[PDB]
């Protein structure tokens, strides 16, 4: 029940706000998280218009495959938070030692507004290979977007606004150009008394 293709598994993912009260005191609020503690399928035709669609778009990448590399995560985000650092962290494992590139596309009404690319290298770990993005800064667009949601009069408006906010993450083997993982993220405001939640789906044609 994981975000895992033939060659790569995303073990952890989180986006957070860390507040430094003093040099020895930090408070961290997780907005969304996977990995802190069969998958249903979603028809890709049902979400195509919420992601970039043209050459290199979600549909185009999905058609190139492999199809077992494509996932849709629905996050119920915990927006209940009160010297600030907005960051993202993620961890991946593979049986192979590869040079990988993670591309993150922030989208508004299915159009790309930001593209962030990071090259990641492997560390040997217990017979396998580990890849990690540790505390990468959230882009200014994202920070502004979080601020905007909080200053909306109602949470009914938050869900309608969040319906047109999506993220597409593409992880590629830099040397073979193979799609190792592709995760499409959709959002809603959480109403859980147990914090942020998620549903992970396999994307199918």
């Amino acid at each position: 029940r994981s975000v895992a293709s033939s060659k790569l598994w995303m073990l952890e993912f989180s986006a957070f706000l860390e507040q430094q009260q003093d040099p020895d005191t930090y408070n961290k609020h997780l907005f969304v998280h996977i990995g802190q503690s069969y998958l249903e399928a979603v028809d890709i035709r049902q979400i195509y218009d919420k992601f970039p669609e043209k050459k290199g778009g979600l549909k185009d990448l999905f058609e190139r495959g492999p199809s077992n590399a494509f996932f849709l995560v629905k996050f119920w985000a915990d927006l209940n938070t009160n010297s600030s650092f907005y960051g993202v962290s993620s961890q991946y494992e593979s049986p192979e030692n590869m040079i990988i590139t993670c591309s993150t596309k922030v989208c508004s009404f299915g159009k790309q507004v930001v593209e962030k690319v990071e090259t990641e290298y492997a560390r040997y770990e217990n017979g396998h290979y580990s890849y990690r993005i540790h505390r990468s800064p959230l882009c200014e667009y994202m920070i502004n977007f979080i601020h905007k949601l909080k200053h909306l009069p109602e949470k009914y408006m938050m869900n309608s606004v969040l319906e047109n906010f999506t993220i597409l993450q593409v992880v590629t083997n830099r040397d073979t150009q193979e799609t190792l993982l592709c995760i499409a993220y959709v959002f809603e405001v959480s109403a859980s008394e147990h914090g942020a939640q998620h549903h992970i789906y396999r994307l199918v044609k």
């Binding site: 249903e40 399928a41 979603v42 028809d43 959480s190 109403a191 549903h199």
Partner: peptide, 16 residues
């Protein structure tokens, strides 16, 4: 099209 009227699993609207 609003997400609510799309061909999606029942779980899509059921926060864990």
């Amino acid at each position: 099209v609003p997400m609510r009227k799309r061909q999606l699993p029942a779980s899509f609207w059921e926060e864990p």
